[PDB]
Design a protein around this ligand. Structure first.
Ligand SMILES: [K+]
Ligand SMILES: [K+]
Ligand SMILES: [K+]
Ligand SMILES: [K+]
Ligand SMILES: [K+]
Ligand SMILES: [K+]
Ligand SMILES: [K+]
Ligand SMILES: [K+]
Ligand SMILES: [Mg+2]
Ligand SMILES: [Mg+2]
Ligand SMILES: [Mg+2]
Ligand SMILES: [Mg+2]
Ligand SMILES: [Mg+2]
Ligand SMILES: [Mg+2]
Ligand SMILES: [Mg+2]
Ligand SMILES: [Mg+2]
Ligand SMILES: [Mg+2]
Ligand SMILES: [Mg+2]
Ligand SMILES: [Mg+2]
Ligand SMILES: [Mg+2]
Ligand SMILES: [Mg+2]
Ligand SMILES: [Mg+2]
Ligand SMILES: [Mg+2]
Ligand SMILES: [Mg+2]
Ligand SMILES: [Mg+2]
Ligand SMILES: [Mg+2]
Ligand SMILES: [Mg+2]
Ligand SMILES: [Mg+2]
Ligand SMILES: [Mg+2]
Ligand SMILES: [Mg+2]
Ligand SMILES: [Mg+2]
Ligand SMILES: [Mg+2]
Ligand SMILES: [Mg+2]
Ligand SMILES: [Mg+2]
Ligand SMILES: [Mg+2]
Ligand SMILES: [Mg+2]
Ligand SMILES: [Mg+2]
Ligand SMILES: [Mg+2]
Ligand SMILES: [Mg+2]
Ligand SMILES: [Mg+2]
Ligand SMILES: [Mg+2]
Ligand SMILES: [Mg+2]
Ligand SMILES: [Mg+2]
Ligand SMILES: [Mg+2]
Ligand SMILES: [Mg+2]
Ligand SMILES: [Mg+2]
Ligand SMILES: [Mg+2]
Ligand SMILES: [Mg+2]
Ligand SMILES: [Zn+2]
Lengths: 305, 150, 110, 154, 118, 43
RNA sequence: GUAAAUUUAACUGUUAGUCCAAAGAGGAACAGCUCUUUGGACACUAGGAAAAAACCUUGUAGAGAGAGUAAAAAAUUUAACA
RNA sequence: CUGAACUCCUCACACCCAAUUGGACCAAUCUAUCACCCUAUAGAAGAACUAAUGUUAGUAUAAGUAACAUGAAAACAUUCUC
RNA sequence: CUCUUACUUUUAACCAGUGAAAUUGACCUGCCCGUGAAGAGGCGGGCAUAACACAGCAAGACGAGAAGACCCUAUGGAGCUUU
RNA sequence: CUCGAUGUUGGAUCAGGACAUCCCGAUGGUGCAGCCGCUAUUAAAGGUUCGUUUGUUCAACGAUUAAAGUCCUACGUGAUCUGAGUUCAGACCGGAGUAAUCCAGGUCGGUUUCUAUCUACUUUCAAAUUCCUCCCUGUACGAAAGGACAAGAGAAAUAAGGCCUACUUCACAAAGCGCCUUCCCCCGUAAAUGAUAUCAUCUCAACUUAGUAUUAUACCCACACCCACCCAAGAACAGGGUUUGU
């Protein structure tokens, strides 16, 4: 009835052995999935208007500046795809939703810290457990066989993506920091009233309206940034350079999807469909893909002639 | 009030009155005082009334006990085992006669709220109503919107 | 602000006896193998720790008598020697603290 | 908000915090084992590790001598640091101290820890020991290990 | 067949269902026509809910109500059915549904002019 | 909305009361009784 | 047709009034306003008018797992033209 | 058709108005005489408390809340910090 | 101040010890409209609705506190002034 | 209704609501050429400035703006704040009175308590409004003067939501003064075909178009390792990591 953990009863000799054993199994399992197209892939249909393909899960490496050919400076966020695989596929009818969904998980984690039901799910899948699992709505033609890895080249420079992540958590906060309230004067007689809400309602109603802005927990919630341009792709390290900043702290997992904004509808005609298969790819992609307007690091210094 | 007290259903003792009527009062125990104004009416009841009352009720054994007491009492016991004690303190001879006659006529069941003013073990002769009592039957017992011989 | 009405014992029992207010059962208690007294898994046994502290204090009191004053920390290593023992080869050049008792079985000479 | 704030708020402010930690560190150098509130020992442990590194620079390094002069309030301990403690750890690159939680303090139920410099002459603490290799689970794993090593050599 | 209910008069345009989310500005008013296209069972459900007694049994009674917008009924629901209730409204026949016997039985009431273009 | 000023059934502005069908029939029923009373008091 | 009335004897409390209908006065043919007058109701019960002192029905007191009633529900839909 | 405490039905009947007024009973206490497991007839009177921001005492609620306290290590010798 | 931000101490929050005060008819203590001694958590019509802590907030409970000090009244007082 | 108390102006803070609309949208009429206007219908999503004197709400004035709307909410809101004014006890001036003392007068000064028991509420998860610039164009219009609309492109402000590469306050981090993202709709009328009424008639006639969204999709979605440790998670609790438990 007392709780236990994985190495509680292990001896000095067995702890290193177990760590090495489980570590090697994880690496071997990841290496066995590197050839999706030689392992009975599902049908690869052509892209059609109205088709929605799967997205990725990436990690927020940090922020970096790049310069366009006109000389403007744009700061970008580095998003690295780490151990991203398709986990589960649910048909349109069974999802209970308008479209079929594809579950994707990224970032490998320790098996010792996962639940039994989760562990046995990954055992039949033949993959190590993932820190985060996200559900992507897709069309029938875009279905991918579970266990297929996904890379950063799935996204190509010049397209727009939507990034969703949990924001930085600031805990319980006052109305000034949380809601941008003006507060009260510092001097001129103010008595213990500088950062207080003030009046929260009118006298007649005799109650506080639901949804009233009050002190409370701030941050640590899911937010989406829409219409972020993909400036550059690094195929060697699988890092998607995206315009602007994304929600959440660096080293957090983010959900990357094709942009939903109406202006960017039906721009996937030239994008990999259903995804990018590096093994299938006839000609290996260059280590860096650049948008036409980006100043590449080795390009000559800008001249306005 | 009804919610603040117990209740029972109307009933009888051993189906009394069905085959024959049996008086349920079984014993009466009087406790009078030779001296004492409280028992004046009880002493006069023992002189002229108790003897004639016993002649009419040969199935009730009456025990008259004369002893010093401030409150004379009559204790009635019934065949079902119920025991009832009623004070006759300062009651007139006529008042006591009425009380004693009432005790003779009671069954001995608890004098509490009776849920229904009637009782029956055979409430239905033609069959108690059920949801199908007045529903017609259909050919082959087919349900609404049911394809037969598919 | 003052209470508008007395709070009933019924309301108070709900607050006071909420499972959040109750003491939680500890599942990390175990028997110390050395001494048999109870201990928590992540905490040193109180019985064994006290035993070590009592011997540590006796040695420190002896160190005091040898130093015989404040600001007299030695510039050499120290060894504790018990009745019936003599300095080893690796105990030469070290301050010797002598204890008038037999070496405790749990205090292995190193 | 205290994201990435690595130091605790102690004592009466920043200066008092250093002085509180310095007294703890001075006691440790003299006695080589002390007990104090868990949080304070955890804070002081980092300084106790770095002090040895300064001691390893030697008594001729003027910067090391100034550091030791500040942190050791009892000047007889400065020779001990350079000539006793630092030579003892000559062959180690770190891990000079061990910190263990002890039962809560009686008076105020404060969480408590014992800290000591490894290699001292004091009676050894009842250190936690991992299960024997001869236990049922460990023997079953030894079999699995033996089996995996034999299959690799083949 | 709750999707095929019929209102008399202009109730499709005039009858309004009012709700409030509870937030400031949360008052919502939709016509029966708008509600019907959004939720094909809401109208019948709301009519029943308002007719049931306003007590704690009401929501229990609602669990025994099974509304389906079309003829499709789950097989389990179909197997337990006992009796179908007669439709309260008699559906009037369209002019194209009358048999020639019925048309012939109704007399011609007037004689149109032979030279009228019609 | 739809408030009646002050108290409902008094004062200048009042809640309108309408005459139902059965209220009319009730009055006519008693008018018939009194009409007959007139007759039997005439002789 | 009815059963009260006056007188004798001995006393207390009430003497800060509300709405409704009606006849008027004041105000502004305002007031849930103010002032008199005739009557009613209320300040006592029950039913009704949605909740309801003042509108309507109805009063004399208990029990009943009977019955006949009183007052008692709001109706209405519209512009052609020589 | 439904629908009152109106009316009828079986049995019973002093048993639904503030101030005020008339009347019938009565708890406990003491005294006279009875009674003698707690009474009777009378004579008396500090003779009856859901309410006076009542008086005294007990214990609740607010509440285990507001608030309050001991510089550090150590051999308890001593030393250190301020 | 535009327009606020960061840090330290206090308080704070959690653990341990000790342990008050005003307040309190009873409470099994929702929202909207309407009603009403005329501004309803408690009435009518609707809607909402498993139970139970901790931390915040100050719109309401015509919140607590002081038998309103303003105003009027009492054949109620007192101070001062005076032809 | 309230005097065994329902705290009295203006401001600060945060605002909820009505539309009888100040700006932005859509329309009919004009003594509407155009640009500006006037007037009415429809529209309450969004917005509706900063200063000088004054206690002021107002008012006047300065500079702007697409516009600086009207009202209700205990003349919203003091258990959130402010106390210049009004309206106690002191004092002066003019005036009244024999005096005490007084006057809608002016003037200087003058203590704003509460530890939250109950109700309510504490991330409406996420579609954006507006000005200006270039261009159309010196075109349509007009005697001339003057001078657009629609589409197209760019750049800003505000609002909402995020972030730290640089700059700045700063420095394992939090921030703005910095940077990044931001997507539907408005129903007033204007027109055909065509009856009652064999023309005509946009029709509370049957009907046809401008003319309409099941507002869209998006977000969220597994769970007895869990004693302990760490944490960009956090008041506690919860949450993430430990394959980083000498
Ligand atoms: K009225
Ligand atoms: K009525
Ligand atoms: K700062
Ligand atoms: K409040
Ligand atoms: K008052
Ligand atoms: K001023
Ligand atoms: K309450
Ligand atoms: K016409
Ligand atoms: Mg945080
Ligand atoms: Mg400020
Ligand atoms: Mg103050
Ligand atoms: Mg202040
Ligand atoms: Mg009213
Ligand atoms: Mg009089
Ligand atoms: Mg009046
Ligand atoms: Mg009836
Ligand atoms: Mg009667
Ligand atoms: Mg009677
Ligand atoms: Mg008696
Ligand atoms: Mg007596
Ligand atoms: Mg008395
Ligand atoms: Mg009492
Ligand atoms: Mg009292
Ligand atoms: Mg409290
Ligand atoms: Mg405190
Ligand atoms: Mg202190
Ligand atoms: Mg607090
Ligand atoms: Mg405490
Ligand atoms: Mg009170
Ligand atoms: Mg109300
Ligand atoms: Mg609370
Ligand atoms: Mg507060
Ligand atoms: Mg109340
Ligand atoms: Mg109050
Ligand atoms: Mg008073
Ligand atoms: Mg006098
Ligand atoms: Mg009061
Ligand atoms: Mg507003
Ligand atoms: Mg309008
Ligand atoms: Mg106000
Ligand atoms: Mg205050
Ligand atoms: Mg207030
Ligand atoms: Mg002032
Ligand atoms: Mg003067
Ligand atoms: Mg002043
Ligand atoms: Mg243009
Ligand atoms: Mg035409
Ligand atoms: Mg025609
Ligand atoms: Zn032990």
């Amino acid at each position: 009835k007392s709780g236990t953990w994985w190495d509680e009863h292990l001896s000095e000799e067995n702890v290193p052995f177990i760590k090495q054993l489980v570590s090697d199994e994880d690496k071997a399992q990841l290496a066995s999935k590197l050839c999706p197209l030689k392992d009975e892939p599902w049908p690869i249909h052509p892209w059609e208007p109205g088709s929605f393909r799967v997205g990725l899960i990436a990690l927020k490496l940090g922020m970096m500046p790049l310069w366009t050919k006109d000389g403007q400076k744009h700061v970008v966020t580095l998003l690295q795809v780490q151990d991203c695989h398709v986990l589960k596929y649910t048909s349109k009818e069974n999802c209970n939703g308008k479209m079929a969904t594809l579950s994707v998980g990224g970032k490998t984690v320790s098996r010792f810290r996962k639940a039994t039901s989760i562990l046995e799910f990954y055992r039949e899948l033949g993959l190590p457990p993932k820190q985060t699992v996200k559900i992507f709505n897709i069309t029938d033609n875009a279905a991918i066989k579970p266990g297929t890895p996904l890379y950063a080249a799935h996204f190509r420079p010049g397209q727009y993506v939507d990034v969703t992540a949990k924001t930085i958590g600031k805990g319980f906060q006052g109305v000034m920091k949380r809601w941008g309230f003006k507060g009260q004067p510092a001097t001129h007689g103010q008595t213990k009233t500088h950062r207080r809400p003030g009046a929260v309602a009118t006298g007649d109603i005799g109650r506080v309206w639901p949804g009233t802005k009050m002190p409370g927990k701030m941050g640590n919630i899911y937010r989406t940034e829409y219409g972020l341009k993909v400036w550059r792709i690094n195929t060697k390290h699988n890092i998607i350079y995206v315009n602007g900043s994304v929600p959440g702290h660096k080293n957090c997992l983010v959900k990357v999807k094709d942009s939903k904004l109406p202006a960017y509808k039906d721009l996937g005609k030239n994008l990999p469909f259903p995804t990018y298969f590096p093994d299938g790819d006839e000609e290996e992609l260059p280590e860096d893909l650049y948008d036409e307007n980006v100043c590449q690091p080795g390009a000559p210094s800008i001249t306005f002639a | 009030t009804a919610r603040g007290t117990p209740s029972r259903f109307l009933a009888s003792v051993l189906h009394n009155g069905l085959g024959r009527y049996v008086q349920q009062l079984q014993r009466l125990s009087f406790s009078v005082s030779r001296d004492g104004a409280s028992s004046r009416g009880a002493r006069e009841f023992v002189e002229r009334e108790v003897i004639d009352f016993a002649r009419r009720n040969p199935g009730v054994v009456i025990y008259v006990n004369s002893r010093p007491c401030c409150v004379p009492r009559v204790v009635a016991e019934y065949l079902n085992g119920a025991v009832r004690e009623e004070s006759i303190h300062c009651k007139s001879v006529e008042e006591i006669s009425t009380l004693v006659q009432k005790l003779a006529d009671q069954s001995g069941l608890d004098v509490i709220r009776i849920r229904k003013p009637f009782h029956t073990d055979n409430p239905s002769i033609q069959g108690q109503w059920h949801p199908f009592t007045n529903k017609p039957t259909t050919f082959r017992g087919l349900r609404p919107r049911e394809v037969q011989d598919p | 602000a003052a209470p508008k009405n007395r709070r009933t014992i019924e309301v108070n029992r709900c607050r006071r006896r909420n499972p959040q207010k109750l003491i939680k059962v500890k599942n990390n208690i175990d028997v110390c193998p050395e001494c048999g007294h109870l201990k928590q898994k992540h905490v040193l046994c109180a019985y064994c720790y006290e035993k070590v502290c009592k011997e540590t204090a006796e040695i420190r009191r002896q160190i005091g008598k040898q130093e015989g004053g404040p600001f007299k920390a030695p510039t050499i290593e120290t060894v504790v020697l018990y009745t019936g023992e003599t300095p080893s080869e690796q105990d030469q050049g070290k301050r010797i603290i002598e204890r008038d008792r037999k070496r405790p079985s749990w205090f292995t000479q190193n | 908000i205290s994201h990435g704030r690595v130091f605790r708020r102690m004592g009466l402010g920043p200066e008092s915090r250093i002085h509180l930690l310095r007294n703890l560190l001075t006691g440790l150098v003299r006695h080589e084992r002390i007990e104090a509130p868990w949080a304070r020992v955890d804070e002081m442990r980092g300084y106790a590790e770095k002090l040895i590194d300064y001691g390893k620079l030697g008594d001729t390094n003027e910067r090391a001598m100034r550091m030791a002069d500040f942190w050791l309030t009892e000047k007889d301990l400065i020779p001990k640091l350079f000539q006793v403690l630092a030579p003892r750890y000559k062959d180690q690159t770190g891990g000079y101290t061990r910190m263990l939680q002890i039962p809560n303090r009686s008076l105020d139920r404060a969480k408590m820890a014992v800290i000591e410099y490894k290699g001292n002459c004091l009676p050894p603490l009842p250190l936690p020991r991992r299960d024997s290799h001869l236990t049922l689970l460990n023997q079953l794993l030894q079999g699995l290990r033996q089996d995996l090593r034999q299959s690799q050599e083949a | 067949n709750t999707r095929h209910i019929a209102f008399s008069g202009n109730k499709w345009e005039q009858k309004v269902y009012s709700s409030h989310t509870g937030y400031p500005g949360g008052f919502r008013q939709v016509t029966a026509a708008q509600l019907h296209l959004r939720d094909p069972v809401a109208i019948v459900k709301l009519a029943i809910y308002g007719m049931l007694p306003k007590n704690l049994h009401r929501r229990t009674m609602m669990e025994r109500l099974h509304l389906f917008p079309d003829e499709y009924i789950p097989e389990d629901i179909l197997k337990n059915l006992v009796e179908e209730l007669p439709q309260p409204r008699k559906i009037p026949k369209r002019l194209d549904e009358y048999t020639q016997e019925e048309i012939d039985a109704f007399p011609r009431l007037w004689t149109p002019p032979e030279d009228y273009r019609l | 909305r739809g408030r009646i000023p002050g108290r409902q059934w008094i004062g200048k502005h009042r809640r309108p009361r309408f005459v139902s069908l059965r209220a009319k029939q009730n009055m006519i029923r008693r008018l018939e009784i009194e009409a007959e009373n007139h007759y039997w008091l005439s002789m």
